[PDB]
């Protein structure tokens, strides 16, 4: 029976591949062939945020596009005012091993997590005037790799237990559990409508998940190594995955197969973080070679390089108005770019 | 000045936050970072209790005016290559190996625990992150190993072992096999200590090894080595 199930599964995979090939007549490279190239992209460093003493692992901007939050291995979660480089807040984390952080859309809460398998939500707007641990979420059996806020009460986290979770903060219990990944889930991205989300794992595949139903809508298998980053397109109909094979890949949900690959010969290091611009025309990807490339998403050509960090660029973010791009590296310095 | 009164007060708050961050960094910088690693039932728990007496679990203790933090990853069922870079820069790595499992084949398989331990030691020691980080090798369960080798030849684990079935010779042979896995002979040093569950000098040996590592780091900082 097991052999029959396996052959049924491989026949279904063959049917999947044939259906994907049938709905593939013009390559994205051919459609975006007569368009005007972006050209050289020159972005200069405008602000340098100093105060972190260990390597920075995470960063999130927020809706106001002015404040931001950074997480570093020294055990401090620092909320900066990027305009004036002022430190608005500095929360001492209970666990120094933090590798993810999120800033709530309302701004009243901030999330963090890491090797302790616990997602900590801190209340920023308190009557006492300080920052307190609003909630601690436990239940993941692996390290917390990413977390994103749906609203003030719902959060979505990814962990190294090949499982994603949707938590109700007030109760503190896992409202929904998304399972089906074979490898460690390393990053997740939330759709603009907050109804679907894509998670990339170490099984060299990405999965589009339905938040409400809890079912896996789609599965995309184009990469050849661990997927370390993922990010929706601004329209929410596509996404981009950076992986360890030194390539980025743009997939589309409606097409259901891979659209584009972003790679160059002199790049052999993996991608730690990816992000899109406001219009989605530019795809920014931080690499292990201490740099941060800027690709033309439509043309797949290299547009720019953000070479200002002395160590691996670990986290990348773009403001919701696209005003600036923040890069946090392992040299304990954040840099804003315009 | 262009700044407003509220802007000036915000800048003053930022300066106070900066000074608190600097104080915290100075407090943390004088504190030893030890990464505890080992195979299943290697003896990490016994080492933890020994240190205490004299996701991730952190053990804090003090010896000779030195504060030691030990990070026992332990129950982290995930790829080590995805979070092992977080421990780059620790003062030392304490690797625990159980001698008695040289002739025990229940890996989880048909390969003994000692081969798996040597594979893990090769992975950690020759990892790109820990090229300069010294390894503190703890060969635990020396008494049970000595009792075992009375009737269980080491040939079960090492078929090229022509030495006698004696505690000292076999122990030296096993130590040499673990030390030969160090490709980074010049950049790092392996400190070997033979321990059990009924000894109290383990913390003293860890203190001495950390002192040697600190002296070497100071010599490298001054360019004198």
């Amino acid at each position: 029976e097991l052999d029959q199930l396996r052959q049924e599964a491989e026949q279904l995979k063959n049917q999947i591949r044939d259906a994907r090939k049938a709905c593939a007549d013009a390559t994205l490279s051919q459609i975006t062939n007569n368009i005007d190239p972006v050209g050289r992209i020159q972005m200069r460093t405008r602000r340098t945020l100093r105060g972190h003493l260990a390597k920075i692992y995470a960063m999130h901007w927020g809706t106001d596009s002015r404040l931001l939050v950074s997480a570093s291995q020294d055990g401090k979660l620092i909320i900066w005012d990027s305009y004036t480089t002022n430190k608005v807040h500095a929360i001492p984390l209970r666990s120094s091993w933090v590798m993810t952080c999120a800033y709530a859309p309302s701004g009243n809460y901030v999330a963090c997590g890491g090797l302790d398998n616990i997602c900590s939500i801190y209340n920023l707007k308190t009557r006492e005037g300080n920052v307190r641990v609003s909630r601690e979420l436990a239940g993941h059996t692996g390290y917390l790799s990413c977390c994103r806020f749906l609203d003030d009460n719902q959060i979505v986290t990814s962990s190294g237990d090949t499982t994603c979770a949707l938590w109700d903060i007030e109760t503190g219990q896992q409202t929904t559990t998304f399972t089906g990944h074979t490898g460690d889930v390393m990053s997740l991205s939330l759709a603009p409508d907050t109804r679907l989300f894509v998670s990339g794992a170490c099984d060299a595949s990405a999965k589009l998940w339905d938040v409400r139903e809890g079912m896996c809508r789609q599965t995309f298998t184009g990469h050849e190594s661990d997927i370390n980053a993922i990010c929706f397109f601004p329209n929410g109909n596509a996404f981009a995955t950076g992986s360890d094979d030194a390539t980025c890949r743009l997939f589309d949900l409606r097409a259901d197969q891979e659209l584009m690959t972003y790679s160059h010969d002199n790049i052999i290091c993996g991608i730690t973080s990816v992000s899109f611009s406001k219009s989605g025309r530019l795809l920014l990807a931080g690499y292990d070679d201490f740099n941060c490339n800027v690709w033309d998403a439509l043309k797949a050509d290299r547009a720019g390089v953000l070479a200002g960090h002395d160590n691996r660029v670990s986290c990348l973010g773009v403001t919701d108005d696209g005003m600036a791009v923040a890069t946090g590296s392992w040299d304990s310095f954040l840099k804003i770019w315009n | 000045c262009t700044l407003s009164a509220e802007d000036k007060a915000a800048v003053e708050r930022s300066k106070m936050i900066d000074r608190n961050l600097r104080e915290d960094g100075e407090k943390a910088a004088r504190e030893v970072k030890l990464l505890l690693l080992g195979a299943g039932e290697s003896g990490k728990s016994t080492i933890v209790k020994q240190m205490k007496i004299i996701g991730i679990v952190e053990t804090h203790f003090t010896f000779k005016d030195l504060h030691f933090k030990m990070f026992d990853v332990g129950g982290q069922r995930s790829e080590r290559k995805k979070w092992i870079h977080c421990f780059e820069g620790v003062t030392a790595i304490i690797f625990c190996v159980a001698l008695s499992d040289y002739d025990l084949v229940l890996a989880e398989e048909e390969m003994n625990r000692m081969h798996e331990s040597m594979k893990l030691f090769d992975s950690i020691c020759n990892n790109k992150w820990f090229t300069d980080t010294s390894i503190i090798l703890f060969l635990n369960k020396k008494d049970l190993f000595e009792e075992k080798i009375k009737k269980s030849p080491l040939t079960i684990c090492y078929p090229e072992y022509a030495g006698s079935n004696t505690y000292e010779e076999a122990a030296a042979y096993i130590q040499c096999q673990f030390e030969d896995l160090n490709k980074r002979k010049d950049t790092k040093e392996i400190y070997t200590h033979f321990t059990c569950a009924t000894d109290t000098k383990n913390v003293q040996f860890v203190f001495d090894a950390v002192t040697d590592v600190i002296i070497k780091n100071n010599l490298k900082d001054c360019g004198l080595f």
Partner: single-chain antibody
Amino acid sequence: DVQLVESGGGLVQPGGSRKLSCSASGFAFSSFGMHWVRQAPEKGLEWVAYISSGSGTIYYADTVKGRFTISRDDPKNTLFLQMTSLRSEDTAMYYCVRSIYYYGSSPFDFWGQGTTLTVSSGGSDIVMTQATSSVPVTPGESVSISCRSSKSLLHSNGNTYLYWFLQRPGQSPQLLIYRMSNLASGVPDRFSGSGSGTAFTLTISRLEAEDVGVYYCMQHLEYPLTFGAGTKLELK
């Protein structure tokens, strides 16, 4: 919840000295700057002194400069005001006010109850004008409280440093609007702040019985903070 309790007030001979202490509980005292503000027996509010968090920055009013000294004991969470050579102009009720400054913060959140001191019997400062002394009002109606400034309170960073306070009869003032637009926490959405430049208005929609009181207009651009003369409301 958070509270500030003032003590040390009483009848003192003019030319003497007196120590006032404000005890703070329920909040991080060391992270809040502290202001001392008097109110005359039948007149409006008047800023007196200020000490920043960590005692780094200290300011005094021109009337009280030299004679008074403001200090804070963070470990025991107390705010001290020493007063020497007291004149007949210092008979007032004093309030200690907490105020934290960062991006998006609301200064002057909480006011102390105040302590009464009664002794036996300028220029280069922005003057805040509230010409309307008092108007009758009917519950459930809409009233607008106007404010005037001699110098524009809008800064180059886009913030208009105007604060609105309400003082109910027999109660300490509380913050309603901070920076001319934002509503303070716990304030009903009835109150709306507006204005631009040197003229400002405060709008109350469908007011009720506990909206009766004196409304004060205070500036925070140049640090010699000045309050308005006051615009009190009466029911019909």
